[PDB]
Amino acid sequence: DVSFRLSGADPSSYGMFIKDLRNALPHTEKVYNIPLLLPSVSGAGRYLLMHLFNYDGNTITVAVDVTNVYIMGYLALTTSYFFNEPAADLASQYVFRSARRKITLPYSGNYERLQIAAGKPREKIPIGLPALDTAISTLLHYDSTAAAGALLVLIQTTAEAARFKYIEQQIQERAYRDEVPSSATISLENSWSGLSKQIQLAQGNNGVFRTPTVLVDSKGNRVQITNVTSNVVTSNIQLLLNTKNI
Numbered sequence: 001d002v003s004f005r006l007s008g009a010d011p012s013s014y015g016m017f018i019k020d021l022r023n024a025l026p027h028t029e030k031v032y033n034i035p036l037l038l039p040s041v042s043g044a045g046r047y048l049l050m051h052l053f054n055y056d057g058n059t060i061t062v063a064v065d066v067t068n069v070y071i072m073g074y075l076a077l078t079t080s081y082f083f084n085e086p087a088a089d090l091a092s093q094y095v096f097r098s099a100r101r102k103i104t105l106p107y108s109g110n111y112e113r114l115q116i117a118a119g120k121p122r123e124k125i126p127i128g129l130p131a132l133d134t135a136i137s138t139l140l141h142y143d144s145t146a147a148a149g150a151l152l153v154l155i156q157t158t159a160e161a162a163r164f165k166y167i168e169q170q171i172q173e174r175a176y177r178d179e180v181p182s183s184a185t186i187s188l189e190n191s192w193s194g195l196s197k198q199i200q201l202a203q204g205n206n207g208v209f210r211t212p213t214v215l216v217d218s219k220g221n222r223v224q225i226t227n228v229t230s231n232v233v234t235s236n237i238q239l240l241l242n243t244k245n246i
């Protein structure tokens with residue numbers, strides 16, 4: 001398991017949590033020096049538990065699929081909550097079994113459905129450590145509309161930060177003040193699968209992407225990633241979705 005506590009949290013302790021999260025995801029090889037997530041894992045070993053504590057010390061446990069870093073569901077006191085999707089129902093067979101009741105959320109876990117439920121795109125939702133503290137607090141007591149927004153914050157400040165050093169740094173910059181994500185942040189989130197695939201396809205293509213990936217950069221400018229010498233590949237991305245899952 002991995003843990004993070006918002007009480008006394010600063011950029012350093014957050015960075016330690018994101019390091020812990022990355023290191024909890026198993027891999028057998030690296031591709032261009034980046035850990036390649038496994039094609040599959042069977043049984044309960046597929047799911048990582050993240051223990052998150054809000055400023056007041058209340059806690060949820062979030063279940064994360066270790067092959068793709070997708071949040072499947074979470075436990076708040078004696079109630080489990082899972083996304084309305086087969087991967088999440090499957091996860092419900094293995095985690096939080098001792099919960100007194102299980103609630104299936106009235107949406108799946110993908111960004112498009114969550115944004116619909118939340119009533120806003122995540123371009124408009126501030127993120128940061130304060131927003132994460134709020135999100136944890138919200139998830140403690142069932143409210144499916146508020147939960148959708150909280151889950152958008154949660155996914156971005158955990159999973160997305162694990163996937164990209166840039167996003168981790170953006171959240172560190174928002175340690176004490178929330179701010180909506182940069183366009184670059186949004187772009188990276190949306191491109192993780194594409195980048196993961198192209199970096200793998202480059203293995204037998206001399207480091208050249210079969211299909212270039214269009215990103216937005218730190219300055220709001222739209223750029224093309226064509227090969228593994230790009231900073232996105234050498235710096236930034238920290239985990240690869242296995243092409244077998246793409």
Ligand SMILES: *[C@@H]1O[C@H](CO)[C@@H](O)[C@H](O)[C@H]1NC(C)=O
Pocket residue numbers: 208226227229230231
């Ligand atoms: C590779 O990508 C680098 C970094 O973005 C770029 O400067 C260069 O033009 C590209 N070279 C090839 C061979 O694709």
Ligand SMILES: Nc1ccnc(=O)[nH]1
Pocket residue numbers: 069070071109110111155159160
């Ligand atoms: N890490 C993630 C979990 C759920 N949905 C996502 O889009 N990403």
